[PDB]
Amino acid sequence: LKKSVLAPVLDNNPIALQVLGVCSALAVTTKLETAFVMTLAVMFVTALSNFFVSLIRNHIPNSVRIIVQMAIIASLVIVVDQILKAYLYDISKQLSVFVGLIITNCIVMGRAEAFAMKSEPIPSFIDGIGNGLGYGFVLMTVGFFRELLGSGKLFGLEVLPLISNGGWYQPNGLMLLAPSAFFLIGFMIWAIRTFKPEQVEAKE
Amino acid sequence: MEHYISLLVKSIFIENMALSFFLGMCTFLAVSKKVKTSFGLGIAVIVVLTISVPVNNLVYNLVLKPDALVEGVDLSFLNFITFIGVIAALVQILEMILDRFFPPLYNALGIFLPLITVNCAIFGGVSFMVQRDYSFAESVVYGFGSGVGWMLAIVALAGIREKMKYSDVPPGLRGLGITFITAGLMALGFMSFSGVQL
Amino acid sequence: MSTIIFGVVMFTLIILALVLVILFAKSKLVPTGDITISINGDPEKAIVTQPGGKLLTALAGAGVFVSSACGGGGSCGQCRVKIKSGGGDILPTELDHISKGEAREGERLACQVAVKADMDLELPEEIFGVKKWECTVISNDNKATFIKELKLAIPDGESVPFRAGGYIQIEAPAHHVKYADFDVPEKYRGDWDKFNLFRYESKVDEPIIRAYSMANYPEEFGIIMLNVRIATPPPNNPNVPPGQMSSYIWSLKAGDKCTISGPFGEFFAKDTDAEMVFIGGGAGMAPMRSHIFDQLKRLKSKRKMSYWYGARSKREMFYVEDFDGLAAENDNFVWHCALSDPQPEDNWTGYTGFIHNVLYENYLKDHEAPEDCEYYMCGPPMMNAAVINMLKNLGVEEENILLDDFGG
Amino acid sequence: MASNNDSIKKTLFVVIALSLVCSIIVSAAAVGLRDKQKENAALDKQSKILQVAGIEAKGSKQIVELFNKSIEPRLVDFNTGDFVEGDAANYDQRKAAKEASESIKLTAEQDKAKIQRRANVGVVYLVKDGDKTSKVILPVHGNGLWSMMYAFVAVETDGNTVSGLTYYEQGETPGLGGEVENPAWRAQWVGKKLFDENHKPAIKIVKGGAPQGSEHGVDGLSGAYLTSNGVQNTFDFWLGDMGFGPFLTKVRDGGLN
Amino acid sequence: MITIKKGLDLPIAGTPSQVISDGKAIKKVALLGEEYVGMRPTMHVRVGDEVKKAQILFEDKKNPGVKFTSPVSGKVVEINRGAKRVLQSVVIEVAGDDQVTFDKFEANQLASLNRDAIKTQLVESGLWTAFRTRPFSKVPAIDSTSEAIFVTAMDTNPLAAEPTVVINEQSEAFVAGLDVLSALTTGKVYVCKKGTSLPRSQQPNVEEHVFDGPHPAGLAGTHMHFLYPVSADHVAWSINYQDVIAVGQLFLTGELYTQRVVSLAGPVVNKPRLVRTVMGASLEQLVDSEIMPGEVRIISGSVLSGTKATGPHAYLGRYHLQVSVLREGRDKELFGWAMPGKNKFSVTRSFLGHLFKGQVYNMTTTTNGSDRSMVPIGNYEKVMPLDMEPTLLLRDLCAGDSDSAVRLGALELDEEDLALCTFVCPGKYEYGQLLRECLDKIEKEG
Amino acid sequence: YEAAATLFYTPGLVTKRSSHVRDSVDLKRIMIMVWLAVFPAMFWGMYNAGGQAIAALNHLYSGDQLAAIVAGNWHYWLTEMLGGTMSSDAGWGSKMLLGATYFLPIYATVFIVGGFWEVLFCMVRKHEVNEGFFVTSILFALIVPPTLPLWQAALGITFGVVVAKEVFGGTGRNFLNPALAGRAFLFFAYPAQISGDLVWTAADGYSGATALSQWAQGGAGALINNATGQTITWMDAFIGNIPGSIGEVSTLALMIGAAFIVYMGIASWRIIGGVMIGMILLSTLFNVIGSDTNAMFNMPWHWHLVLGGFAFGMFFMATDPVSASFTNSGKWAYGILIGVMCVLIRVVNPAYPEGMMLAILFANLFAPLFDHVVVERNIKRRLARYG
């Protein structure tokens, strides 16, 4: 079937249609390796948080629900960070400056609020995985352009030889700043809504 | 006095939470259509930050700091969960305040009201305060100034989007994509303070 | 080990203190008192209701339910209520169905109002008088190729108080119906056999309600009659299940019992001296028959009026004896009928083509003052759009155009 | 809400049970894995010391074997630049900077700033080419969040910064904190003098790019003003009298023999 | 005294001599359906019907009770209808002298008459259509009242007649109309004028207010902005001085007074002057043998806000007191946008023409440019003397933001209040249509 | 073809409605007037770039070395071939020719590429091409160093035209300054070609600081022309005998051009006066406060006026009506903000020697907010029925 893991990639993208993961999309997308690691972390954390929130969704009072959800999310992220620091030290060094951004990524909390609080556990897990895939689509597309045009590299591998290295390419210094990410996301949304006219916002 | 004025100006302009540091972007891009809605959300964010930074200052300095309670005990692995718990309780109270007294703003916010908890600027401000080792008074001033800068940013974006009623934007860009472009141009404008030390 | 105990105890205490602080001032911002929701308004006759609910749900519980059609979400917009004290703001979703002038009077959507404090309503006395009946089926004859004629009677000699153009809601339970169980005479079953319509079936899981219009006028004492079309799946999608409510009503036979909810007021004829023009097509014959019979017989109005009916073929026309008798009795009524696509076996001579074209070419083109007369409308959506375009080109105003979009 | 979730008893039980479970799991993970995290950090520090020295290594076993063989830590008194007694391998200069009420610097003798303290005894690493001391690695640090690096000089000192320079701990903005993630920037340090004929600090972080072939000049960080300034302040201080000045004077004079 | 500083007096050629002459003989008159805002007619006549003076021709569906009567006695010859059968004009051929007669009173009883009696007489005569409401510039509902009736006794329009010359011939009728208005108001009567002397009403609730300055100092919207600001809760009625003379004549003699004095002026008029005519007169018959040869445009009203009088519209409008004639400008000029411009008028100083003071121009109907988007060089603020933000309001009108426009002051305005903004616009926007669309929306949703 | 006829002729249309008479002014007239007002600055800029380059070249090289330098640069040997000379006794004709060899390719590139983008967007959205791109292109071509690469000029004009204007609907429909957005794109993308000490004089192998960089180092006593050995005077900076961006150097020429369009009513004297007020106030406050380590504190307002791109920005780029405030009080506030921001970036930001393009782009973000404040006061006045 697999009709649920693929909807939030193009039809219900968390960044292009919902506005839910923007800050890290601006932060981590200068390198494809960092974007890939962040994609995996967000997808894993959202899946597990959705599962655990749906497991106890019928016992959560409405006046402590934010506290319950955030306690679960923060505990998961902290445990993952400790495990990475103990067993995957290099990956941990990659994600160390961004660990606190994973907790406040609006995708995790928004999917727990919108879906997990009213859905079944396995569907909530699948929803988390699919929204992570849609997040990673945008992250990898933006990081491709940013890394290639700002450093002539893809995943750290030399693609465009630089003038300082005896090559011909002069890196673009605006690709190492946030405005380039803003513009790339805007043009990506333009293309997506050109191919999906149903997502065009009404003139009224 | 000059110390706190310098800190306040730095928090508002030199280290603006939105057009520097690029934090709290989701509601900044979504809820900037109307100046008055943005103004109310900015007031709410100011209040939350101004209570959050000093309370987490006290909690860190009395409980979570190394050797704060018992010699040889850290408890600093609980920082993030404690900080987010404080913010979550505050937004829980703010939700019923807005439901009782400000129904228009409560309805305009929608699903973004409970997501004020994970507005990245508030958690980032608490973290910056702990990194910089502020005092209680410095925490109060810093949380207030960071909120003020974020509100100034969103109100300016709402003013531009209101002037853009005369624009003719292509349909694929109408709304979100053009707002992304607008925020990028705003960041360009704010790069005027990049190398000043305040 | 010591640091683990300290961590768990301290974190648990911090969370407990925060939650206690939340519960305090949850007790102060969220009221738990009673509500004086004055449903009757002037006599402050209220209902005891727990807060946090919805206005339409409380109304349904108290039994003075309003004309709801979709259960919430702001889609239908038919749950109109008037509030003069209560919720201090109107939801923007309501503005899609509420104008500024309406909101100034106090109109609101019952499915969007949140029960938070005391309020008073000004529902019309018609709502206070609505009540429920269980009817007896007299006959369920077939009048056209896809059209039925259901007739009901209210027991104990009572007659429902209704006006021409009004409608009722009929309740149905959960029931699985097979298309082969219907009864259709030999004249109208030729197309059914040709298209093999009997192989379908319908299933109902939970009870549903639908709105329907009467085909009689108040002088028909104790008898409620209706015109219902079969909800056959579209030919372009043969693999779609057919309709539920229409199939259930079709399955009704003579002698069975049915349960109606009461008359509702809509699509009335304004009492002026202007000429009336009734344009109907397809299954929209019931409101036209009600209006025309009411006008000619009950109040015996002398206003000039006429009826224009557009059918598909000669087999689908009915009530011809009634219309001819009305025309012969009263010289102020003249009616004409047209067929969109007559069959060769029909041997028809007369008006053909679309009814709006026939009306424009025969009556409205040479009319002195088309704008000075009133138009009543019931038929397919495409025919509705066509006649509206024609009348607007003739210069007729919206206030003089009345229609009920029952859906062909 | 639902059932009896609004009940005070239900709310308190739910939150207390969740807090117990979450804090137990978090605390067990944090306290259990501390030793492994510390070992990983120590191994990463022995690496990048090997890397700055130019000794190629990969894997924990190879790194540890090449250490304790090619490198021997030593203590330095800073004030006089004379060697101090042993136990160099297990010295914590970062902690000694705070404890023992060690030297606190006047606001006029700062530069790198946000250090506010100074260990009276530092640690240096001498890389051995068999039995002789070929050159020495100097740890220096300065502000810009908190930036720690490994400066590399030869036995001549004034005339060669050897094999380059590495940052082993920083938290600057990615895409603008490219002082480590770009080996091109790190390669520009090879052959720089650190001093002039007058024997005073001369390293300059040239804004806009240093001229080709210039001595004492290394390109700044594009779009990273105040981080280039922190890097400049680090060397301004640690090459001065309050830093490795006396030690580097003893070197080039006979300290390393 | 109120002095207006921001504004413009258009230095167009062909100013009239302020001396009244007898005009041509008129054989056809009309009532124009489209010049009454929000009006849907109900015909009471048919082609070939004989009519009297003050006999009802049609009625308003949207304003019950309001009657539109015949200026003259004669026969109905045309009922012209446009797209979607919109009533364009009802043309009557003059013949005979039959009329409908009403009650007459003495001069000293007019100020004490009953408001219901005054309303009944005005509505039956058809003179009620002389009043317009602010907001929305509509004929008042016949059961409504106003606390402010504004009399327009001045004219700042280009090539306009001098109200003093007209009033001084009809002083008794002007004062009688003022007395009737004082009885009708229930608030005050505002006689807005220039500094020169006019006949005066002795009633204490009739006040004279002097306005000084260029156009639009003589506009009723300017007067209301400065004396009685209008909104949804405060509504004023306006009426011009010739209609006040007509009201006085009606209540003094019992007969409908349909004589008008208009100016026939413009760059192609041989002898610009004031002429005596009748309400709704044929402009083709009036400007016969008065115009230089060539292609011209006849306007009912002024060059700023008037109606192009061609075909079924070639008749004097109800609220118009002048006829303008000027040439049609269709030539294509090579580099005409870049010439020094000694004979080019502008409110900017980018042409040589402003250096010659007292120059008059033979202006034509050319648009001196193409349609473009608004680049705000500050022209709107030069000609707009009311307390508004004109650029922001005009951008509201362009974008279709009716709520924002109503906040910014669109309810206080008529189409004639934005004519100078249309004039000085470099992008060639027509703002009166945008204002009317906004006002129609506001009224429909109101 | 239709392209030439539309620009050369007047449309020949009549009014359809409303005001049957119109003003003579139109957008084409407005734009061409602003375009012609920078011609004195452009001619002085070409002549000055040529003269600066010739002075530096003859300072550096001599004889056969100078001949070899000339033979290896197409600008130099084209100036020699067309009749000029690269010698120290060169005239104003030689200097203007050498400066034209630098300005004309930049301007041609910018005009062609930006016009391509405008024509594409107008064809797709089915509108007529308007003016405004003339002003945008000539201003962008005048605000760059003489040595700028042509591919970088193309990228900058592309960013400014597409990202700042066309995506918002074109002329009249945006909020940000397009030419300054393109300049900012260049500034943050390729700093080595639009800043530093190798970029502002077009002499091969010549290194020189310019006046704002020299004052930041040593005050008024550091202002020396190293190509000629002379001290830079206030009259030199006012007349324009200094290096920098092509069309910025002559405050006198910019003032002559600005007087005409201010008198015409095209540029806003309220904006210009606000800029002057903000500049004077902030610089005088810095002068009164003083500093022992920052020499930028003791620069007076009249030295602020003649250095950098301040006069160019104030007279031609802050006066852009579409990017500014739409009210008079807002215009005063908008100008004051620009002036304060420029002096502030000049003095207390050591990353940048100038702050004019950043200052105007910053104020573009706040112009709608000033208008909003003014309009809310107006709305309150209305609700009170005025008096």
Ligand SMILES: Cc1cc2nc3c(=O)[nH]c(=O)nc-3n(C[C@H](O)[C@H](O)[C@H](O)COP(=O)(O)OP(=O)(O)OC[C@H]3O[C@@H](n4cnc5c(N)ncnc54)[C@H](O)[C@@H]3O)c2cc1C
């Ligand atoms: C005031 C009022 C008066 C009315 N009066 C009349 C009247 O007098 N006579 C009359 O005939 N109608 C009338 N109507 C129309 C009314 O909607 C009828 O109930 C109509 O017959 C609807 O048919 P139904 O409810 O049996 O089937 P519906 O529930 O409307 O469904 C039938 C349609 O839905 C499709 N469908 C069914 N199940 C599915 C599925 N699972 N997935 C997808 N598609 C599906 C079918 O193929 C078919 O197209 C009136 C409506 C109103 C509001």
Ligand SMILES: Cc1cc2nc3c(=O)[nH]c(=O)nc-3n(C[C@H](O)[C@H](O)[C@H](O)COP(=O)(O)O)c2cc1C
């Ligand atoms: C309108 C305009 C705006 C400018 N803005 C800046 C700026 O913001 N930052 C900058 O470094 N240079 C800017 N410049 C370039 C400098 O003003 C100047 O030409 C160059 O820096 C010469 O160096 P100087 O500052 O020493 O005179 C601008 C130039 C112009 C014409």
Ligand SMILES: Cc1cc2nc3c(=O)[nH]c(=O)nc-3n(C[C@H](O)[C@H](O)[C@H](O)CO)c2cc1C
């Ligand atoms: C006085 C004046 C100044 C202008 N200044 C600029 C400018 O600095 N930059 C620019 O790109 N366009 C400028 N323009 C052109 C035009 O107004 C601008 O590109 C708009 O922003 C286009 O919508 C100017 C126009 C005028 C009339």
Ligand code: FES
């Ligand atoms: S991810 Fe930062 S606010 Fe949404």
Ligand code: FES
């Ligand atoms: S039930 Fe649908 S609008 Fe109320």
Ligand SMILES: [Ca+2]
């Ligand atoms: Ca130390």
